[PDB]
C-alpha cells in the first residue's frame, strides 16, 4: 500500500503544483492601482500598491523556493523506486540475511532523508499560507474604507465578494481537474493563461490576479478543456458585470482582494498536497523500518524478502517510474499563451473553447 500511497501524493502533489505556479503568475502579472484621477483615494492606492508588492513577493517565494522543492521531490521518488528496483533485481539471487540487513538499513535511512525533505516542503508552505492568512485578512480592511471613502453600499460590496468566493470554488475545481487529467498524457502539455477577470473597458486597472486557464495540448497540440473551463471563467465575468453599479475604485480593490485570498486558496491546497505526499514517505519509512527490525529479530527471513521485492519490482514499481519521468517533462514543458491587451481571460478562452 505504501507504493499507491506514494503515487497518488505524487500525482496530486504534482497537479496541484502547476495549478499554484500559474496562480503566482498570475499574482506577478498584476499592475499596480492607479486612483491618479481622485486625488483623496491616494492613500488607498498606496495600501492596495503595497498589499499587491507582499502579494507579489509571496508568490516569488512559491515559485522560487518552493517550486523546486516540489520537483525534487518528485526526482527523489524516482531515485527511490530506482534503488527499490536496483534490491529487487541484484538481491534475490544469492543475497545472504547480512547483505539483506545492510539494504534495508541503507534504503530506510535514503527513504527517511526523502521523508525529511517532503516534511521541510510542507513546513515551509505551511508558514506560507500563514502569512497569506494573515496578509489576504488584513487586505481585506482596506477594501471596506475605500468603499467606505466614497460612501459605497457596504451590502452591495459584500454580496459581490461572497458570489466570486462561490464562483472561485468553481473554477478551482475545473482547473484542477483539467490538470490531474492531462498530468500523466504521454507526449501532452499544460497550456495556461492569464487575462482579466472581469469584462475589459478601453476608457479601472484590470485585475489579473487570479484570472487564470489551464488546458490541456495533446501530443498533436490540439487544445482541450477549453470548453469546460469556458463556462466557470464566463460565469464570474458575469457576476462581475451584474455590479457595475458599484464605484470603480472599489470594484479594482474588491477584485485584486479575492485575488490575494484566492492565493491564500491555492496555498492551502498545495500544504494538504505537501501533507498527504509526507503521510505517504512516512508509510513507506515505516515499512523498511518494520522489515529491519523484523529481519534482525527472526521474524522474517530471506525469503520473505525475496518474495516480497520480486513481487514489488513486478507490481506497482513501473507505473511509478513512469509518473515521475511524465511529470518531470510535464512540469518542465508547461505553455504560456500571451492573452491580447484588449481580451479579458474568459473572451480568451471562449475564443478557444470556439476552435475545440
Known amino acids: 500500500i505504501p507504493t499507491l500511497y506514494m503515487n497518488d501524493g505524487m500525482n496530486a502533489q504534482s497537479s496541484q503544483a502547476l495549478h499554484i505556479q500559474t496562480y503566482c503568475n498570475s499574482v506577478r502579472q498584476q499592475i499596480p492601482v492607479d486612483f491618479g484621477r481622485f486625488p483623496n483615494l491616494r492613500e488607498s492606492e498606496r495600501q492596495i500598491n503595497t498589499g499587491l508588492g507582499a502579494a507579489r513577493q509571496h508568490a516569488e517565494h512559491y515559485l522560487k523556493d518552493i517550486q523546486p522543492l516540489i520537483i525534487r521531490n518528485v526526482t527523489n521518488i524516482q531515485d527511490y523506486f530506482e534503488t527499490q528496483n536496483l534490491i529487487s533485481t541484484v538481491m534475490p539471487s544469492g543475497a545472504t540475511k547480512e547483505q539483506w540487513l545492510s539494504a534495508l538499513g541503507m534504503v530506510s535511512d535514503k527513504a527517511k532523508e526523502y521523508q525529511e525533505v517532503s516534511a521541510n516542503t510542507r513546513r515551509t508552505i505551511g508558514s506560507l499560507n500563514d502569512k497569506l492568512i494573515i496578509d489576504s485578512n488584513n487586505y481585506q480592511l482596506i477594501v471596506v474604507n475605500l468603499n467606505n471613502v466614497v460612501n459605497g453600499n457596504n451590502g452591495v460590496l459584500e454580496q459581490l465578494n461572497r458570489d466570486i468566493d462561490g464562483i472561485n470554488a468553481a473554477i478551482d475545481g475545473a482547473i484542477a481537474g483539467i490538470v490531474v487529467g492531462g498530468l500523466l498524457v504521454i507526449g501532452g502539455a499544460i497550456v495556461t493563461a492569464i487575462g482579466a477577470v472581469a469584462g475589459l473597458v478601453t476608457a479601472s486597472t484590470p485585475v489579473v490576479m487570479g484570472g487564470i486557464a489551464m488546458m490541456t495540448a495533446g501530443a498533436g497540440g490540439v487544445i482541450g478543456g477549453a470548453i469546460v473551463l469556458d463556462k466557470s471563467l464566463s460565469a ?76 514489488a519490482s513486478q507490481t506497482s514499481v513501473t507505473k511509478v517510474l513512469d509518473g515521475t519521468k511524465i511529470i518531470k517533462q510535464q512540469m518542465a514543458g508547461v505553455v504560456v499563451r500571451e492573452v491580447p491587451a484588449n481580451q479579458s481571460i474568459a473572451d480568451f478562452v471562449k475564443r478557444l473553447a470556439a476552435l475545440e
Open 236 to 311: 464570474r465575468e458575469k457576476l462581475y458585470r451584474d455590479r457595475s453599479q458599484l464605484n470603480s475604485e472599489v470594484l479594482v480593490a474588491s477584485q485584486i482582494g479575492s485575488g490575494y485570498r484566492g492565493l491564500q486558496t491555492q496555498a492551502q491546497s498545495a500544504v494538504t498536497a505537501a501533507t498527504q505526499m509526507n503521510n505517504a514517505w512516512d508509510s513507506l519509512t515505516s515499512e523498511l523500518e518494520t522489515l529491519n527490525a523484523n529481519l534482525r529479530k527472526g521474524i522474517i527471513d530471506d525469503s520473505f524478502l525475496r518474495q516480497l521485492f520480486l513481487t
